[PDB]
Amino acid sequence: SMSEEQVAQDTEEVFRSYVFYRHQQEQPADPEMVTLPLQPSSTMGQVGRQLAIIGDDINRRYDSEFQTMLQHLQPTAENAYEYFTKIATSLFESGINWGRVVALLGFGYRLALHVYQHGLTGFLGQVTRFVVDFMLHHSIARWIAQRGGWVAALNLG
Amino acid sequence: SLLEKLAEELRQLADELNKKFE
């Protein structure tokens, strides 16, 4: 009724909406996020849009911290995958919850935006895959399926 | 760590999000 692969496909759709609407709120603009094509309005698109709004205030308070640490991290095309996986693993080491799932979407957004601002174009799909595959391989996609799929993320907050 | 400190910030972010979710 809700396989891990189904959640993975939904995650890509949720994340694209998350990226577009989160960037639209915060707006130098990232044209890759301004022009990111999205599927027709759907429940999955609605989740990503709602998850973007609920972080509007909080994200600004954390900008200075994440942006300073990403500058110190100096993520690149060669090390982005390793760094994402280690950071995401530590985040979920003590358990899975909706806040950490949303935080993972947010880190993917921040990581993709940071590398673009430093010249790494055409990498947004790579970061999307990082997010999707990490969830799939680290039991997060299954966790969402156990909660009924991404529809359970609707109206959080 | 830098990587662990980033994961720490993400847990703290997740904590504030969870508070709003409940």
Side-chain angles (χ1 to χ4, degrees), chain A residues 49 71 79 110-111 123 126 142-143:
Chain A
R49 186 174 190 173
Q71 279 286 46
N79 65 31
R110 289 192 181 272
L111 180 59
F123 209 73
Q126 290 279 336
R142 187 181 66 260
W143 184 90

Side-chain angles (χ1 to χ4, degrees), chain A residues 54 58 61-62 66 69 72-73 83 86-87 90-91 97-100 102-103 107 157, chain B residues 2-18 20-21:
Chain A
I54 63 173
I58 301 168
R61 234 195 310 115
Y62 284 80
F66 279 112
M69 302 186 77
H72 289 349
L73 183 66
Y83 290 165
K86 291 179 181 180
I87 291 167
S90 180
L91 170 60
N97 55 62
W98 279 117
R100 290 179 178 181
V102 177
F107 181 62
Chain B
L2 269 173
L3 301 171
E4 181 53 28
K5 285 187 178 181
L6 278 161
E8 178 57 20
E9 290 299 308
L10 290 169
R11 292 186 204 100
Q12 300 184 7
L13 184 64
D15 283 351
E16 296 203 42
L17 291 174
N18 282 323
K20 189 165 185 173
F21 298 169

Side-chain angles (χ1 to χ4, degrees), chain A:
Chain A
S1 76
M2 184 66 65
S3 69
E4 295 176 284
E5 175 58 22
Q6 180 62 54
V7 173
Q9 297 177 17
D10 293 335
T11 301
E12 194 269 2
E13 187 177 2
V14 170
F15 185 68
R16 289 177 80 110
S17 281
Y18 181 83
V19 168
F20 171 82
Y21 284 107
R22 171 158 178 180
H23 193 71
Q24 193 176 226
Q25 292 171 178
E26 299 175 351
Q27 288 296 305
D30 180 348
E32 303 184 348
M33 301 183 175
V34 175
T35 65
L36 181 61
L38 301 173
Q39 295 189 236
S41 186
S42 71
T43 306
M44 295 303 107
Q46 187 184 166
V47 168
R49 186 174 190 173
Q50 293 183 2
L51 294 180
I53 302 167
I54 63 173
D56 187 60
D57 292 327
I58 301 168
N59 296 334
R60 291 194 304 272
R61 234 195 310 115
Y62 284 80
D63 280 334
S64 58
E65 293 79 358
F66 279 112
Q67 294 170 347
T68 292
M69 302 186 77
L70 288 173
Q71 279 286 46
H72 289 349
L73 183 66
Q74 296 282 299
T76 68
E78 286 74 12
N79 65 31
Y81 172 69
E82 173 186 342
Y83 290 165
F84 180 94
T85 303
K86 291 179 181 180
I87 291 167
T89 298
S90 180
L91 170 60
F92 290 95
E93 180 174 356
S94 61
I96 303 168
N97 55 62
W98 279 117
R100 290 179 178 181
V101 174
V102 177
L104 184 64
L105 300 178
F107 181 62
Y109 172 86
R110 289 192 181 272
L111 180 59
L113 181 60
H114 184 268
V115 297
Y116 170 83
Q117 294 170 343
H118 291 64
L120 176 50
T121 55
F123 209 73
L124 185 57
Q126 290 279 336
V127 176
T128 300
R129 185 172 172 274
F130 295 168
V131 174
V132 171
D133 289 7
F134 179 90
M135 294 190 357
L136 197 57
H137 301 329
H138 294 68
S139 304
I140 300 165
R142 187 181 66 260
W143 184 90
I144 294 175
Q146 293 182 350
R147 272 82 278 295
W150 274 102
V151 295
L154 285 177
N155 301 131
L156 286 172

